[PDB]
Amino acid sequence: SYQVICRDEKTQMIYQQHQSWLRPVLRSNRVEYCWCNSGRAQCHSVPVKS
């Protein structure tokens, strides 16, 4: 089948392609940015201070 969705085990939520979905922080105060670049759920972390 096609592969564009993004299964996130951090919450068990699936997303579409190029769809961005933020995840809670770990213990500090940063936000987890996770978006689907093709089906591998791309991600990065950008703190609130900017």
Curated annotation (Swiss-Prot):
Residues 7-17 are annotated as: Important for binding to annexin A2. Residues 4-46 form the Fibronectin type-I domain. Disulfide bonds join 6-36, 34-43. This is Tissue-type plasminogen activator chain A. The gene is PLAT.
